């Protein structure tokens, strides 16, 4: 009975035959990443991934995709974080992100680790996902900056955080977006992303072509006239940036 594709604004999609009630429910449903090639294929209920196995979208006939399964028993499920649990599988990487970025020492002095591109990509490419626990703006804005190194606003109601000890990739590597450092001249942006495992989160997307082994940076976008409400290191850099202008 034919096949539906639902594209999110970020370029990922859900694809499959819908059931009698018109739900994306079945054994042969897939989520396809924004490369229109990497896919998680298997059992979904009402568009929610129950058992998605890593696959490649090879071709499409009369609108109907063909998937070849990748080796391994890489399987994924919808596993939205809570305020305390960042993931059921903190050490299981996202397979699309794995092929595109890695973590290494930042090239920015005294900035710890940073996120780097594995491959040359063009503009508008989703590179990495910023998943974390979900907490409130009230909580975040009421606590010390020391606790807010990794907080990223998701929307008016929710802030995503990667709190200790999940700021170390030895404890958490299911996503890596929290490892991109700040620049006032960035090559990437944060953008909304609907992820079949993490749910509604943000991703890191290039705004220009990037080379292999280039460090990926984003503007953190703190309020410069709430001086700035920002960590001291950012305040130093903001002064330098305005000076160059």
């Amino acid at each position: 009975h034919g096949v539906c594709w639902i594209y999110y604004p970020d370029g990922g999609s859900l694809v499959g035959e819908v059931n009698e009630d018109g739900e994306m429910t079945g054994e042969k449903i897939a989520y396809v990443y924004p490369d229109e090639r990497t896919a998680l294929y298997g059992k979904f209920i009402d568009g929610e991934m129950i058992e998605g196995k890593l696959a490649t979208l090879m071709s499409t006939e009369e609108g109907r995709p063909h998937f070849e399964l990748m080796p391994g028993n890489s399987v994924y499920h919808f596993d939205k974080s809570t305020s305390s649990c960042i993931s059921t599988n903190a050490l299981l990487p996202d397979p699309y992100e794995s092929e595109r970025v890695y973590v290494a020492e930042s090239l920015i002095s005294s900035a710890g680790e940073g996120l780097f591109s594995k491959v040359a990509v063009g503009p508008n490419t989703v590179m990495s996902f910023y998943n974390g626990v979900r907490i409130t703006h009230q909580e975040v804005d009421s606590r010390d900056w020391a606790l807010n190194g990794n907080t990223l606003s998701l929307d008016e109601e929710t802030v995503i955080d990667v709190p200790e000890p999940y700021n170390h990739v030895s404890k958490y590597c299911a996503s890596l977006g929290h490892k991109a450092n700040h620049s006032f001249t960035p090559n990437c942006i944060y953008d909304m992303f609907v992820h079949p495992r993490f749910g509604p989160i943000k991703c890191i997307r290039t705004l220009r072509a990037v080379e292999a082994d280039e460090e990926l940076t984003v503007a953190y976008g703190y309020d410069h006239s709430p001086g700035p409400e920002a960590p001291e290191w950012y305040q130093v850099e903001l002064k330098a940036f305005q000076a160059t202008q």
Binding site: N148, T151, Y220
Partner: peptide, 7 residues
């Protein structure tokens, strides 16, 4: 406001 990328 103690988080990145607020609208």
């Amino acid at each position: 406001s103690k988080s990145a990328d607020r609208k």
